[PDB]
Amino acid sequence: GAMGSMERASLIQKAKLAEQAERYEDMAAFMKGAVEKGEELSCEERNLLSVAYKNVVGGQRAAWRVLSSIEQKSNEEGSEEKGPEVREYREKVETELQGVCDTVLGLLDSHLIKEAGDAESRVFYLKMKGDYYRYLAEVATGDKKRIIDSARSAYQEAMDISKKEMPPTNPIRLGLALNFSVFHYEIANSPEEAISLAKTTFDEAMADLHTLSEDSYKDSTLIMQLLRDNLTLWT
């Protein structure tokens, strides 16, 4: 761990600076270093961890999709063989993406999840575990089935806790439901489950808005709009 010699507080400060500078690989490395100090993460710190790795893996997913599309075209009926380079480079990006997902899953398993007792932290980390198995599933082929079930299992455990312990407008609960619904649609080939979850999530949050402050209202309605965006594409 290259960050072993830096103070925890310094790593967090530098993570925030890296975010401001849009240096998300640095941000992720700082937050990994902070996690490896062994202490639980605060709410702000959990969000720094998630933002950093989401940005890193996001660039990799976008690149992988570009290359996978080029690869497919080069295999269509009537394409000129362009040698191994597209496949080779797609495999390179794919391997780097898998390495990042494996790093995140490692932090969750050693030892963020097991030390997470409060619902807000445990649901947050289980959602992350679902998300990074989902990103692995997007590039998998054969043990795709096992990866998909790992994602499903993480998301389901998060959903069970969130429904027992959080209000329907809680933003963590809402973002979990959004992502699990996209899992159902894109990964599990269960569009009806995806639509049902999105609708039920949206309707139950609508009925709980009346309890929120102006600040909380803005936070919940933001994610609700994403559920609605998806439902519009799906129905």
């Binding site: 998630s50 933002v51 989401k54 940005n55 996001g58 976008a62 959602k127 998300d131 973002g175 979990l176 959004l178 992502n179 996209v182 649609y185 894109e186 994610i223 994403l226 965006d229 998806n230 594409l233 799906w234």
Partner: peptide, 8 residues
């Protein structure tokens, strides 16, 4: 890409 939580 359908909408998921957080950045991008």
């Amino acid at each position: 890409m359908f909408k998921t939580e957080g950045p991008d």
